[PDB]
Paper text:
Sodium/proton exchanger 1 (NHE1) is an electroneutral secondary active transporter present on the plasma membrane of most mammalian cells and plays critical roles in regulating intracellular pH and volume homeostasis. Calcineurin B-homologous protein 1 (CHP1) is an obligate binding partner that promotes NHE1 biosynthetic maturation, cell surface expression and pH-sensitivity. We find that NHE1 assembles as a symmetrical homodimer, with each subunit undergoing an elevator-like conformational change during cation exchange. Each monomer is made up of a dimerization domain (TMs 1−3 and 7−10) and a core domain (TMs 4−6 and 11−13).
To identify the Na+ binding site, we first prepared the sample in the presence of 150 mM NaCl at pH 7.5, and the corresponding complex structure is termed as NHE1-CHP1Na/7.5. One of the four classes featuring clearly resolved transmembrane helices was selected for focused 3D reconstructions of the transmembrane domain (TMD) of NHE1 and yielded an EM map of 3.3-Å resolution, which is rich in features, including densities for sidechains and associated lipid molecules, allowing us to build a de novo model of the NHE1 dimer. However, we were unable to resolve the CHP1 molecules from this small set of particles, probably due to severe conformational heterogeneity. Superposition of the complex structures determined under different conditions demonstrates that the NHE1 dimer structures are nearly identical in the presence of Na+ ions, at either pH 7.5 or pH 6.5, with a root-mean-square deviation (RMSD) of 0.6 Å for 840 Cα-atom pairs. A large funnel between the dimerization domain and the core domain in each protomer is accessible only from the intracellular side, indicating that in both pH conditions the NHE1-CHP1 complex adopts an inward-facing conformation. A cluster of proton-titratable residues are located inside of the funnel chamber, including E131 in TM2 (E131TM2), D172TM3, D238TM5, D267TM6, and E391TM10, resulting in a highly negatively charged cavity which is suitable for both cation binding and proton sensing. Nevertheless, we did not observe a bound ion in the NHE1-CHP1 complex, possibly due to the moderate resolution of the EM maps. Upon the structural superposition, it is apparent that the cation binding site of PaNhaP is conserved in NHE1. A putative substrate ion is likely to be directly ligated in NHE1 by five oxygen atoms from sidechains of S263TM6, D267TM6, mainchain of V237TM5, and a water molecule. In the context of inward-facing NHE1-CHP1Na/7.5 and NHE1-CHP1Na/6.5 complexes, the CHP1 molecule exhibits high mobility relative to the NHE1 dimer, resulting in featureless CHP1 density in the EM maps.
Author numbering:
A (entry chain B), B (entry chain A): 87 to 506
The structure:
Amino acid sequence: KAFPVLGIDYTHVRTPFEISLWILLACLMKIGFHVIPTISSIVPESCLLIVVGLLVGGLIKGVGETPPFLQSDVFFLFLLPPIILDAGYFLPLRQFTENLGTILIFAVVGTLWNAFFLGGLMYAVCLVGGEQINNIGLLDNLLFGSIISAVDPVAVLAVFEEIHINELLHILVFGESLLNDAVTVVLYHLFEEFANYEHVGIVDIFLGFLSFFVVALGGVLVGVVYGVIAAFTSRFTSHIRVIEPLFVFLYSYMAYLSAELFHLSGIMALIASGVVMRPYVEANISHKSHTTIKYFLKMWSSVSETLIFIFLGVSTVAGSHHWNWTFVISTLLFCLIARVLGVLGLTWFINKFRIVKLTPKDQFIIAYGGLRGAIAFSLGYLLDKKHFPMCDLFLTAIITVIFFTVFVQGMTIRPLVDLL
Amino acid sequence: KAFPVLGIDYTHVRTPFEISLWILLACLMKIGFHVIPTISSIVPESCLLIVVGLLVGGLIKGVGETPPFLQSDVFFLFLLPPIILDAGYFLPLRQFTENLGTILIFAVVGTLWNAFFLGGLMYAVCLVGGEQINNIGLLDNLLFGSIISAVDPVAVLAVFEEIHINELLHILVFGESLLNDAVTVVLYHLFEEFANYEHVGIVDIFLGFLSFFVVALGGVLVGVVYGVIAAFTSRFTSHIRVIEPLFVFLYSYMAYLSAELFHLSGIMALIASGVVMRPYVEANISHKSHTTIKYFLKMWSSVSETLIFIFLGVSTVAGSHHWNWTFVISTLLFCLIARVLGVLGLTWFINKFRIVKLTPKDQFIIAYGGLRGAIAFSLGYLLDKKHFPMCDLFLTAIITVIFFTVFVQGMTIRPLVDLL
């Protein structure tokens, strides 16, 4: 062997190199996405992430080598908590606790309505059209309804500006997105656990409801415990001003992992820890350290969302698909109808309770404009084949819903709202 | 199964939870290390990291479960480039290119001298005392000499202050540490490759020398290419001010990985990329983005060094040891003598070339005070057992050298320098 050390060893650096290449491509085309005169306020960033994922998936398909995949743990352990922490750390408490009732009712009850309505009506149409979807079942369909109700409405706010977005609408969609991402994951775990055993009774359903509430609240309690501990430690960190962000991220991640240890709601725990610590930091912390906390949250969340959408593109271009016309058309039309009905009913019921009525403007913004992405795909994609034999059909439906609700309900929300 | 979702599943979150627990313990005891009236300027941070690693190793030994380990790739791919980027990104060019000759000669020639002198003299004493080290060999001993010459003198600067540290001494120890960490890894790969085949000739030695230079310079060239590309892209990133740090880190890491792809010097490539980009960033970048670049470099380097030293503590408490009195005493005394002789000779030879003589002050600071750590241990620890059957003895010697040169040559450097 001439030239002793020199080599061409590529298998050594394949995961880090390709991951860095994907992130670099996404960021490069993101800075190529803002220089365009007016596209930043015409399409959401979600469209850009879809397009980047499509390009990378096309590249991988052209190369022909094995497509990468999330190993059902990298997601829940390293890609979800960044997104959740970026969202929940910048939650404005003054205008959150001011209307916690409305945000809570929308997030929880609207997600439960959307999930159960989609699951039930998808199951009903599965009973109708058969021979490819005839054998779906209920508990296998409520899971699809829950993982397709993981809506992300805050992505649409990049299309609007200071007007058309009240104080109330912004925090409302913020809380909907955040607590919806929590509740959909809790429901995902609940239904995935029920799917195993075929003997489900009234007692089992009651225990499932009880366990839903126990999971959510136990996550919350773990969050408060770790947030209080983080506040106490941040009050003792004047001397070394470089590790303060590291304490914030470490305590949030440990709250998430301690919740996930008991199968409690890690998302709720992380949100609670961030919310509880926020006021108690920024008062004991340098302004530079606060700024770098914000910057690292933004950057790390952007990287996680980018990687998830890259996997979405790889799965949609270089994946197996089970297009069924009835199921896909039914799920699109029924997710839209369920969202609209839920929003209308909930606004009608709460406007009999609040001093400031939710205007039809914001009702339309919430109903038509709630767009999936980056959690719905990931939650549906980690469904194994050992259970849920129609998980390929579930991915096809979820990908179709994501594409339709990001490229149509998100790109054509700004003009229809002027047509009020 | 009552309580459907509730569980106690710990194997799911074991690596992330224990890693976060270690980092939290280290940072907590770091902030407990600065509040002490005067210990920050009495001992280096290296001593604190050794103590944290010892405590965590004792905890793991008490628990009794399997000790974690670096899989020979996590180090070179995720723990080395953080340290190297923190060091080389803050390299002051004005006072680096001003005396590049002296820094370069110290780093390269002094490391080569230290490595070859230690290897040869360790081999000579191995020929003398036997029955446990009688069968070591030369090429198996030059590798130990190289991996024990990975000195980190900048750790001692935390013990001094604005006086006793000239303009020249600071940049000199900085460059020594940085380019020494590069050269020792290049030599590690060279000797690890030679160790395989037992038929080494004059042609092979010449080719090894040639390949050493080719590896170093090819790393440098990859570094300049990626640094120029990073500068060009940073000049086009005014619009989105949140991804600028992400471009910096992405381009540095891609330079490192592209160098490691060809087995070139990844450390040299990363240093070159950072140096080449630095002036061309901070002129096209927001001040906040520059500050967060600095903060993330510091924090991520601190985390990597902490994890490496935690592994050091785990290996020294919960590892297998092959204490040999002659080898250990010989390596301590000979590493000290080699360092002193190399420093004295090189300063004598270059003070006949420079206008500003290197004073005996800084000669003593460099010679006695060059302390190993966080690279020497890791480089020695990734030695397999399939080759190098005495790698246990090599770890024992390296750990002993680290402890002695951090707790003795680093803790008792500040008083002996007053005794000038």
